[PDB]
From a paper:
As no structural information is available for bacterial RNAP- σS holoenzyme, we reconstituted Pae RNAP-σS holoenzyme and determined its structure through the single-particle cryo-EM approach. Focused 3D classification resulted in a single group of RNAP-σS holoenzyme particles, from which a cryo-EM map of the RNAP-σS holoenzyme was reconstituted at resolution 4.1 Å. The cryo-EM map shows strong continuous signals for all domains of σS except for σS1.1. The weak fractionated map signal of σS1.1 domain in the main cleft of RNAP suggests its conformational heterogeneity and low occupancy. We compared the binding affinity of Pae RNAP core enzyme towards σA1.1 or σS1.1 by using a fluorescence polarization assay. The results showed that the σA1.1 domain binds RNAP core enzyme with a Kd value of 220 nM, but the interaction between σS1.1 domain and RNAP core enzyme is barely detectable under the same experimental condition, indicating that σS1.1 binds to RNAP core enzyme much weaker compared with σA1.1. Structure superimposition of the SutA-RNAP-σS (open lobe) and RNAP-σS holoenzyme complexes shows differences in RNAP-β lobe conformation and main cleft width. In sharp contrast, there exists substantial steric clashes between the modeled dsDNA and RNAP in the RNAP-σS holoenzyme. RNAP-β lobe of RNAP holoenzyme is in rapid equilibrium between open and closed conformation but with preference on being closed.
Numbering used by the authors:
A (entry chain C): 679 to 775
B (entry chain F): 57 to 230, 238 to 334
C (entry chain D): 16 to 931, 946 to 1126, 1135 to 1376
D (entry chain C): 533 to 629
E (entry chain C): 1116 to 1356
The structure:
């Protein structure tokens, strides 16, 4: 592409609205995977282990005996946020996978 | 260059005034009591060298710097006319008591756009001291119950007094003048609606019976005549106050039925 | 009606007439109840009540007597709008002088009092004492006095000396200023004084005192004793949510001046001494200062606000400079905006409109149909029906909207085509549909652009949008005759594929009967779209107007070319269709259809092209694939061969053979030569890529590639953009201005590298940064050009002048650029056109030149025809329609009332968004050489060398016109060949620009006279006997004795007689400049015309805007004042002054030039005042006062067109010359006799005064004038109306000048009527102003 | 990540001119040449690079590999702006045997 | 629209459409292979012919046999995701190699049949799959219309930004466009009657309802403010004369 269209192409991806159904692009650049982890909207597991119970509102995981302290090993509650009013009046939700 | 400031050009003229001596000021007050045009004029310049230092202390108020100097002069004129030569007191010692009262007399009348009497300003300055004192010992945001507790005042009274200090900011400082609207109706569609509605009322009162129309035109004054009460309209058409009230309900129902079949709904009028 | 508004000072008796009461108390409202009280700023006794027909007590609230007054209080009953007209005034104890007469640089009080600006301020502040009415005293009125100085003055005088200090001392002098006697003192001493700074002060004294008395103004009206107050409705107190309210900044300024006035009103009987009576007056003088204007001297501040107080001077100006906020923008009703959307199923004379917008914009129109039909008698019942959106409302909504046109316009408008009326059609959606063909005029794409909408209401506006602003009327562009509704990119692509010819296709060689029978075979599938067939057509020729004939003819065309003829009407021939039908082919087709058939059939023809263009484009599979960008096999051969040559150059740089200063030029010249070699091999492969086979052996035809179709048709793309996709990009430019030595080898298809892509960013970011700045400069350029061409409206139909300008084709250069037929198209003729033979006439009078006369003049050999230009026709108050050319939008002549001044300024600012050797003479054509303005004597050898600096070589063709005209330098050797045919490329001159040739017409022995050795000449030779001559010395490096000596090599006969040249008694002599090398020694015979000595020798918007401002460049060219003898000044004096001495009349006056610039140091030559001496930029100021007005208009149009033709735009010459007429309206007077010496008067005002004064007994009352060129910024302020000068810039200086002068304004312009509210005098508003003046002239 | 040049202690949009609104050859690996918001402020606002890292004093630094005369070592160093004029920075993609 | 390629030179937009066809083309063969109930050993060979065939990163032979094969086949049934760096993209020879595996034409173009006329197109067109976006430029917040509303106090001008709003500012450049034509009644209508006229707009609204298109002269409210403000400075104005 040209340098003029690359400047305008970088603005179309900035002012994008999240749709109802999310579909991964067939063609990517490789940076689409490392850009979602650094953002604060994705839930990243801190302590690895076995998922005891999962729900649409919260995700509870059981911490293994290796990477845990002496007391209160399996204490980790991940509360997923529901639709809240964003700064640009757009819905924000998290879905378990 | 040199700017002809009102404060610099005034203070330069003060240096050309001799000092006031306690021995001669007593003799000058004796000549002013008998009556002399030059005695009161000369003695006015003696106490004038003190107005530049008294007004310089008060700052950060509603009045400008030049207003404190002119107001302080009016205090010594009312103080030099009343002096006791037999008491032996100093003339300047009595002048400093009137200029301080005259400064505070004008600091509360020209500080706000709304003219306020002495009865309501004596409560705002006290609450201003109470709001500053209670905020120092507590070191937090003062509440409405805290002011009414220390001052021993009702909770409803301290709310109305604090609301009088409007302190309105600017308007053109951005605009605000373009965003504000008018409270009165100015829409062309609303003014045309009031025209068609008023013309239909005079048309409906004429299309009905002539007897049922003149009993309501004199009671409420819809046709433009003077309004009359039940006793005032009794001596006009019928002295029987009960008979003229029955026909009012009959004309009220006829005007209601003629409005429903006219294509206009009563519930749609208020909306 | 009303007119003739006046501006003057207010009198104390007049202020008390507008006022209804006196205010003395700053209190205006109460805290107990939000109702005003008596004697306040918002009071009801002076101003109106707070509501309609109400009072303070509330006893009378009826509508029977609206004019009655209340008896309990002073507030009477009135309406609610009465608070905007009533006003009050304050009573001041001491008068205070205003600041308007002291804020401007020339103090209006000081010029009338003969005082300075600082001295008039020292008296008002009680800082110095002045004396008035001295009489028999030595003290003067202008002299100052102190406290001790005034006391000593009374001791020596004793009486007749009154010294007053303050504002009353200044007012006491204005009453006895004796203005009638003060003018006599300056007029009697006018011839006595002789100074430059005193004459200018004398002119301002007489021009202001004459206008002061002629206006009926009084001197005591400058200072005002009372101050009027603004009505309270302009500064209201509106409460908002929360119990709070708002107060304007003006209420605080009025409160400060009222309380200080009462403090002075109560200190009049307290026997105040002198110490305080002088300071309390300054407290009031500074309050009026803060009320009038802030930021200049006072700069008053308030609490909790860092910005200064908004005074009365800052509220009228506002933002956007001096222009008011109301003039720059005004909100209107019945408007809206939405996103555009292209619709192919819409007619040209209509557009789209959503149902949700048509119901809100036409809301009052729906209420008029429901009451007239009988469905809803009450307007309230009809309002509830339109909101519910029942099925009956949609019936009347489509009925009220059937022929009511609406307006559509984009947000930025640069020309008249931005606002075009359309017929709304109800659609379903939330977007406004637009026709695809009118998008070229709106300059808007379907990428998110929002357009406005407007709804006309009155019956006069509906007929206006159907006659002039309709979409079917403005087809031709206001700049050139080319239509703007030309088929766009998408429809042209569909038409280019239709008009094609294939070598082998299905259904070739068949014969069809008619166009209807040929179309039947294509839809059946037995005939291809482009195949060689033989059809019979039926066309009509319109060679004779009023008669149409039919004829049958069988031609050999294709199936696609025959289907296109079914779209064009029968009025046009068939030869306009057999072409390839590119983008430029259809642009010439609509322009030919507009001038043959008419307009009713052109709209139908332009609409049918969009339908047949889109229908045949959707059937085509035109798509851009990766295989379309073909790469030629010769690309790898040129790159590998160029890479091996650079390796040979860089290896020689390390050895020391080639330098770095020359290596940079060789690399950029090697890759550039390789850049064109790839482009020639790429286009040769793309044009002949498709190879078809028929009847055995294969053949070659034009390639049907998808990328080549978009370039050959010209619909979208250019030829340079192909070199970036399938070819090398080449060298790129650095932001600093240099070019990188190494180019980009790869292209967009093969992929760029990380470093090669970083180079292309330098040119891309610079391009994106310029498009953000041109929007501000082009918008600022069109505002200065339209503000000087508003009062120019065509009002006359017959002027009667016989002047004009000579028109000639663009003969400069190697070939012609602009023909004659494209320059005089639409311009009437000035004089009679003459044939090459005498006693012959072609055009009898000033007839309008049309397309019929263009071909009539092209067949003849006529090339120089004079036309009538807007710079001619000196009539006043507009420009006649005869001298003006034809209309640009309409094919007929310009009617009476069209504002040609606005359409001329917009045609220049419209294309602003798109705009950012000489050794020998080699002719490219052949013809007879004809020399003009060249004086060359014969040569004994036969070379015919001409040493004249004025001359031009022109070759004439067989018809007699000059095809090519070159420039001949001075000292060029050229052989004449008049009457002989010249071959192409033959050398005619062999001059050398490195050395300045010096020749002498005298033929004989030459001897140096006045040459001193060691001072003027130095015997310096070269090494190894390289040059053995006599080198002269410089003027600055010479000694003091040889500074005033000038060598002069006089030429005489060999026998000893003095030889002189004919024409002048002075004998011809050879020039000997400084640092000259004479090869021929003295005492030897020299031929005539031989070399005597050897002497060695931006662009864009800032360039086009520099010509209209008459800005002098940094380096101006030096010319001659009066023609005659040319010489050299004295070098010892320090100023080279070339003296002149003509043969007819000797002029002792001359000019001096500094020694900083060296040019034409030759001693002894002709003057040639018309010819330039110092090479460089030429200033337009010196050209007007030297040659005349015809060359200045010819120079401006020539230089302006060279800037617009570089980008590719074409602008007619009528709009460039229209602005030149307004800039040449001001003239200067040298010897008036009837007016001032140096003043600025109009040319039309001086011509009427000259002609009227000539009709007398003396016949010499008139005077002489001189034309002067002014810029666009200075010509805008030189107007009689103060409204046009206040809205442009600096409304403070123009508002004060109109006060002391008392000018009466006559509303007869365009910008003056848009602020008052009346109709404009241009357009359809001329008939309204014609009946107004007719009624006024009758009495 | 967006870094702007306006605000307190910086040039505004009007007094910028053309030098501030232009790209410099020293923006290789530090400032994105192609990412720039279009409009009135073109060139004043420019985003950082992917491997951009601030220096100790506050300057911009970019990572580079150490290249010897025989082979390319795996030592990665962060180079400053003024110190990049001495060394010869090669291309990211080159022929490797 | 294919006409935007030459001027707006973006070759990567066409190469993305061709590469997107091979991503969805290979996804249909994997989803169809699951419906035939093929063995797990046959699916591992097809996945090895995709990641371990073209140049780049190849990762396989590190997952479970039965568990991970059915998990990847059900997730890649809607397209195989492709990664193309910003400067290390795949050449033209590698894109055409993927279309050959999916039994698709390597040219990337195919002739499409029309739906309205039913006739086949003359030239082959380019089809594929392109990742599209949606910007926050909805027309619900852009469409506005207002006939009559409220006005200010100092200047009787229509307001904007309230609950009911929507209007276009008639700038100065809009005035010069009307002066270029012969329009005089339209320029005076939208400057004196349609705005800055209290008694003018009241009588004009009543004339439209009755059905009489007529206009009164009136006086602009923006001019009466300039008269009162210029008189307080001491300057006299003889407006009547
Ligand atoms: Mg656009
Ligand atoms: Zn009352
Ligand atoms: Zn004329």
């Amino acid at each position: 592409d040209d340098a003029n269209r690359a400047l305008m192409g970088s603005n179309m991806q900035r002012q994008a609205v999240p749709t109802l159904r999310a579909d991964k692009p067939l063609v990517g650049t490789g940076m689409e995977r490392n850009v979602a982890r650094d953002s604060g909207v994705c839930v990243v597991a801190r302590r690895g282990g076995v998922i005891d119970s999962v729900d649409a509102s919260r995700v509870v995981v059981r911490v293994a005996d290796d990477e845990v302290e002496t007391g209160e090993a399996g204490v980790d509650i991940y509360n997923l946020t529901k639709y809240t009013r964003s700064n640009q009046n757009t819905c924000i939700n998290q879905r378990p996978l | 260059t040199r700017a002809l400031d009102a404060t610099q050009l005034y203070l330069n003229e003060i240096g050309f005034s001799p000092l006031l001596t306690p021995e001669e000021e007593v003799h000058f007050a004796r000549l002013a009591q008998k009556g002399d045009p030059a005695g009161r004029k000369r003695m006015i310049e003696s106490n004038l060298r003190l107005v530049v230092k008294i007004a310089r202390r008060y700052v950060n108020r509603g009045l400008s710097l030049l207003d404190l100097i002119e107001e302080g002069n009016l205090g010594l004129i009312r103080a030099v006319e009343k002096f006791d030569p037999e008491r032996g007191f100093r003339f300047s010692t009595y002048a400093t008591w009137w200029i301080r009262q005259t400064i505070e007399r004008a600091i509360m009348n020209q500080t706000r756009t709304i003219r306020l009497p002495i009865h309501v300003v004596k409560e705002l300055n006290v609450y201003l001291r109470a709001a500053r004192e209670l905020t120092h010992k507590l070191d937090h945001e003062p509440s409405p119950e805290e002011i009414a507790n220390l001052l021993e005042k009702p909770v409803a009274e301290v709310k109305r007094m604090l609301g009088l200090n409007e302190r309105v900011t600017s308007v053109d400082v951005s605009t605000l003048l373009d965003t504000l609207t008018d409270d009165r109706p100015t829409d062309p569609c609303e003014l045309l609606q009031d025209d068609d509605l008023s013309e239909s009322i005079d048309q409906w009162l004429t299309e009905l019976t002539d007897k049922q129309r003149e009993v309501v035109i004199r009671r409420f004054g819809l046709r433009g005549h003077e309004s009359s009460t039940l006793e005032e309209v009794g001596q006009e058409i019928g002295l029987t106050r009960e008979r003229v009230r029955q026909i009012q309900v009959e004309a009220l129902k006829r005007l209601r039925e003629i409005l429903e079949k006219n294509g206009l709904s009563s519930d749609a009028l208020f909306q | 009606e009303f007119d003739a508004i006046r501006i003057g000072l207010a009198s104390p008796e007049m202020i008390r007439s507008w006022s209804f009461g006196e205010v003395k108390k700053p209190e205006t409202i109460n805290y107990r109840t939000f109702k005003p009280e008596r004697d306040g700023l918002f009071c009801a006794k002076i101003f109106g009540p707070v509501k309609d027909y109400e009072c303070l007590c509330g006893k009378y609230k009826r509508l029977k007597h609206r004019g009655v007054i209340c008896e309990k209080c002073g507030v009477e009953v009135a309406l609610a709008k009465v608070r905007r007209e009533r006003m009050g005034h304050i009573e001041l104890a001491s008068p205070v002088a205003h600041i308007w007469f002291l804020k401007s640089l020339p103090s209006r009080i000081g010029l009338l009092l003969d005082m300075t600006l600082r001295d008039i301020e020292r008296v008002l502040y009680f800082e110095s004492y002045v004396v008035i009415d001295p009489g028999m005293t030595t003290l003067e009125k202008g002299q100052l006095l102190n406290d001790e100085q005034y006391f000593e003055a009374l001791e020596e005088f004793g009486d007749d000396f009154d010294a007053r200090m303050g504002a009353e001392a200044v007012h006491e002098l204005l009453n006895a200023i004796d203005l009638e006697h003060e003018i006599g003192r300056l007029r009697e001493e006018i011839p006595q004084t002789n100074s430059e700074t005193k004459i200018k002060k004398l002119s301002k004294r007489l021009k202001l005192m004459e206008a002061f008395q002629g206006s009926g103004n009084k001197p005591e009206w400058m200072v005002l004793t009372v101050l009027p107050v603004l009505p309270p409705d302009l500064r209201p107190l509106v409460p908002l949510d929360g119990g709070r309210f708002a107060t304007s900044d003006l209420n605080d300024l009025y409160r400060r001046v009222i309380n200080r006035n009462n403090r002075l009103k109560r200190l009049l009987d307290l026997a105040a001494p002198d110490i305080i009576v002088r300071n309390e007056k300054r407290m009031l003088q500074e309050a009026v200062d803060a009320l009038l204007d802030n930021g200049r001297r006072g700069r008053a501040i308030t609490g909790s606000n860092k910005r200064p107080l908004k005074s009365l001077a800052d509220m009228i100006k506002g933002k956007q400079g001096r222009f008011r906020q109301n003039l720059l923008g005004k909100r209107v009703d019945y408007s809206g905006r939405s996103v555009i959307t292209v619709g192919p199923t819409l007619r040209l004379h209509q557009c789209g409109l959503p149902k949700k917008m048509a119901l809100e914009l036409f809301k009052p129109f729906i209420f008029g149909k429901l009451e007239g039909r009988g469905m809803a008698t009450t307007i309230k019942a009809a309002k509830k029906m339109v909101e519910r959106e029942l099925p009956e409302v949609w019936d009347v909504l489509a009925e009220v909207i059937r022929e009511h046109p609406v307006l559509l316009n984009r947000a930025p408008t640069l020309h008249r085509l931005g606002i075009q009326a359309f017929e709304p059609v109800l659609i379903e959606g939330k977007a406004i549909q637009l026709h695809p063909l009118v998008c070229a005029a709106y300059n808007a794409d379907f990428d998110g652009d929002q357009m406005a909408v407007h709804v006309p209401l009155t019956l006069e506006a509906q007929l206006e949008a159907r006659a002039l602003m309709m979409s079917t009327n403005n087809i031709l562009s206001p700049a050139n005759g080319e239509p703007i509704i030309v088929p766009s990119q998408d429809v042209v692509m569909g038409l280019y594929y239709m008009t094609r010819e294939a070598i082998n296709a299905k259904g070739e060689g068949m014969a069809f009967a008619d166009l209807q029978e040929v179309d039947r075979a294509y839809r059946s599938g037995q005939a291809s779209l482009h195949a060689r067939v033989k059809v019979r057509i039926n066309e009509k020729i319109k060679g004779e107007d009023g008669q149409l004939t039919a004829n049958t003819r069988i031609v050999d065309t294709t199936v696609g070319r025959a289907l296109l003829f079914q779209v064009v009407p029968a009025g046009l021939p068939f030869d306009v269709v057999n072409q390839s039908m590119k983008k430029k082919a259809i642009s010439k087709l609509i322009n030919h259809c507009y001038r043959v058939v008419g307009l009713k059939d052109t709209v139908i023809f332009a609409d049918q092209l969009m339908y047949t263009g889109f229908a045949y484009s959707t059937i085509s599979g035109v798509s851009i694939g990766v295989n379309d960008f073909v790469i030629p096999d010769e690309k790898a051969r040129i790159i590998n061969a160029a890479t091996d040559e650079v390796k040979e150059i860089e290896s020689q740089y390390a050895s020391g053979l080639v330098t770095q200063g020359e290596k940079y030029n060789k690399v950029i010249d090697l890759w550039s030569k390789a850049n064109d070699e790839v482009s020639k091999a790429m286009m040769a492969n793309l044009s002949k890529e498709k190879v078809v086979d028929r009847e055995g052996k294969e053949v070659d035809q034009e390639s049907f590639n998808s990328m080549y179709m978009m370039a050959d048709s010209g619909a979208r793309g250019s030829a340079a953009q192909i070199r970036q996709l399938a070819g090398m990009r080449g060298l790129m430019a650095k932001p600093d201005g240099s070019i990188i030595e190494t180019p980009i080898t790869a292209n967009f298809r093969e992929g760029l590298n990380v470093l090669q892509y970083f180079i292309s960013t330098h040119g891309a970011r610079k391009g994106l940064a310029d498009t953000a700045l041109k929007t501000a400069n082009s918008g600022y350029l069109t505002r200065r050009l339209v503000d000087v061409a508003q009062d120019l409206v065509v009002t006359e139909i017959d002027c009667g002048t016989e002047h004009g300008l000579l028109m000639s084709p663009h003969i400069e250069g190697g070939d012609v650029v602009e023909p004659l037929g494209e320059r005089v198209l639409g311009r009437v003729i000035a004089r009679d056109v003459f044939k090459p033979g005498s006693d012959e006439v072609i055009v009898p009078a000033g007839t309008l030149i049309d397309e019929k006369w263009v071909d009539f003049l092209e067949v003849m050999s006529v090339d120089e025809v004079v036309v009538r230009s807007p710079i001619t026709c000196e009539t006043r108050h507009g420009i006649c329609a005869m001298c003006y050319g034809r209309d640009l939008a309409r094919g007929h002549r310009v009617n009476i009332g069209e504002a040609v001044g606005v359409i001329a300024a917009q045609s220049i600012g419209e294309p602003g968004t798109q705009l950012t050797a000489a050794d020998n003479v080699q002719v490219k054509n052949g013809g007879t050489i004809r020399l003009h303005n060249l004086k060359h004597v014969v040569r004994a050898d036969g070379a015919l060398v001409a040493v004249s600096r004025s001359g031009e070589l022109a070759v004439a063709d067989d018809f007699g016109r000059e095809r090519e005209r070159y420039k001949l330098p001075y000292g060029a050797v050229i052989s004449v060949k008049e009457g002989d045919k010249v071959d192409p490329g033959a050398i005619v001159a062999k001059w050398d620009p490195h050395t300045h040739p010096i020749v002498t017409e005298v033929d004989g022995t030459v001897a140096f006279v006045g040459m001193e050795e060691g001072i003027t000449v130095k015997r310096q030779t070269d090494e190894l006997t390289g040059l053995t001559n006599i080198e002269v010395m410089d003027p600055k490096d010479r000694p003091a004795a040889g500074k005033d000596i000038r060598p002069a090599v006089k030429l005489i006969d060999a026998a000893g007689k003095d030889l002189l040249l004919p024409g002048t008694d002075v004998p011809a002599q050879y020039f000997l400049p400084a640092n000259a090398l004479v090869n021929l020694t003295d005492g030897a015979k020299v031929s005539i015309g031989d070399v005597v000595a050897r002497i060695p020798q931006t662009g864009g918007l800032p360039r086009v805007a520099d010509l209209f401002e008459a800005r002098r460049p940094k380096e101006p060219s030096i010319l001659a004042e009066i023609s005659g003898t040319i010489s050299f000044g004295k070098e010892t004096k320090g100023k080279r002054r070339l003296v002149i001495t003509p043969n007819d009349g000797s002029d002792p006056y001359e000019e001096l030039i500094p020694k900083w610039r060296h040019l034409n140091v030759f001693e002894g030559e002709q003057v040639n005042r018309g010819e330039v001496i110092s090479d460089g930029p030429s200033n337009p100021h010196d050209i007007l006062r030297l040659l005349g007005v015809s060359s200045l208009a010819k120079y401006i149009v020539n230089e302006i067109q060279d800037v617009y033709r570089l980008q590719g735009v074409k602008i007619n010459d009528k709009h460039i010359e229209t602005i030149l007429r307004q800039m040449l309206r001001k003239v200067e007077v040298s010897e008036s006799g009837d007016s001032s010496f140096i003043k600025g008067d109009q040319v039309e005002l001086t011509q009427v005064l000259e002609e009227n004064e000539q009709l007398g007994t003396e016949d010499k009352f008139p005077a002489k004038y001189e034309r002067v060129l002014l810029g666009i910024t200075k010509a805008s302020l030189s107007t009689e109306s103060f409204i046009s000068a206040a809205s442009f810039q600096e409304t403070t200086r123009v508002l004060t000048e109109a006060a002391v002068t008392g000018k009466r304004d006559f509303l007869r312009g365009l910008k003056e009527n848009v602020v008052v509210g009346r109709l404009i005098p241009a357009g359809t508003g001329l008939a309204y102003h014609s009946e107004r003046k007719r009624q006024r002239d009758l009495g | 990540r967006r870094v702007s040049a306006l605000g307190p202690g910086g040039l505004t949009r009007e007094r910028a001119g053309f030098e501030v609104r232009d790209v410099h050859p020293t923006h290789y690996g530090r400032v994105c040449p192609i990412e720039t918001p279009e409009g009135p402020n073109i060139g004043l606002i420019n985003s950082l690079a992917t491997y951009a890292r601030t220096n100790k004093y506050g300057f911009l630094e970019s990572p580079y590999r150490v290249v010897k005369d025989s082979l390319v070592t795996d030592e990665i160093v962060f180079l400053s702006a003024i110190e990049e004029a001495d060394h010869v920075i090669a291309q990211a993609s080159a022929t490797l045997n | 629209n294919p006409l935007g390629v030459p001027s707006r030179m973006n070759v990567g937009q066409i190469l993305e459409t061709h590469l997107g066809l091979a991503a969805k083309g290979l996804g249909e063969k994997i989803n169809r292979m699951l419906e035939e109930q093929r063995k797990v050993a046959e699916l591992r060979k097809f996945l090895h012919e995709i990641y371990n065939e073209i140049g780049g990163r190849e990762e396989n032979l590190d997952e479970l046999g039965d568990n991970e094969i059915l998990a990847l086949a059900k997730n890649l049934r809607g397209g195989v995701p492709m990664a193309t760096p910003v400067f290390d993209g795949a050449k033209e020879r590698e894109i055409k190699a993927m279309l050959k595996l999916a039994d698709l034409p390597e040219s990337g173009q195919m002739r499409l049949f029309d739906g309205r006329t039913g006739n086949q197109f003359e030239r082959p067109t380019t089809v594929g799959y392109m990742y599209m976006l949606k910007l926050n430029h909805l027309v619900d917040d852009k469409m506005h219309a207002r006939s009559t509303g409220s006005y200010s106090l100092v200047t009787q001008q229509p307001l904007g930004g309230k609950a009911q709003f929507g209007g276009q500012r008639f700038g100065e450049m809009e005035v010069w466009a009307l002066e270029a034509y012969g329009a005089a009644y339209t320029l005076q209508e939208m400057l004196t009657v349609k705005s800055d006229d209290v008694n003018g707009r009241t009588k004009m609204y009543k004339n439209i309802v009755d059905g009489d298109h007529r206009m009164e002269a009136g006086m602009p409210e923006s001019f009466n403010v300039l008269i009162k403000e210029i008189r307080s400075l001491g300057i006299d104005i003889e407006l009547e004369t």
